[PDB]
């Protein structure tokens, strides 16, 4: 049960999910990267929630 055991990212700012394919993140949270094939939106996993967030709101930790 280590869904956060993947490519990690840092949440630079607070974000609120707008669509069912979006997830809410908070500044200072460590997000898990699931898909970064998009330049503007990155699919991440927070705790248990999977969805997309602004790529400009997240930074590669690795």
């Amino acid at each position: 049960m280590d869904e956060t055991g993947k490519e990690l990212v840092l949440a630079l700012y607070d974000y609120q999910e707008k669509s069912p394919a979006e997830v809410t993140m908070k500044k200072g949270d460590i997000l898990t990267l699931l898909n970064s094939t998009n330049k503007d939106w990155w699919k991440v996993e927070v705790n248990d929630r999977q969805g997309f967030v602004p790529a400009a709101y997240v930074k590669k930790l690795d």
């Binding site: 503007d40 997309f52 709101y57």
Partner: peptide, 10 residues
């Protein structure tokens, strides 16, 4: 994947 531009960084 959202087919639109994401919100600008605050």
């Amino acid at each position: 994947a959202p087919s639109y531009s994401p919100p600008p960084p605050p």
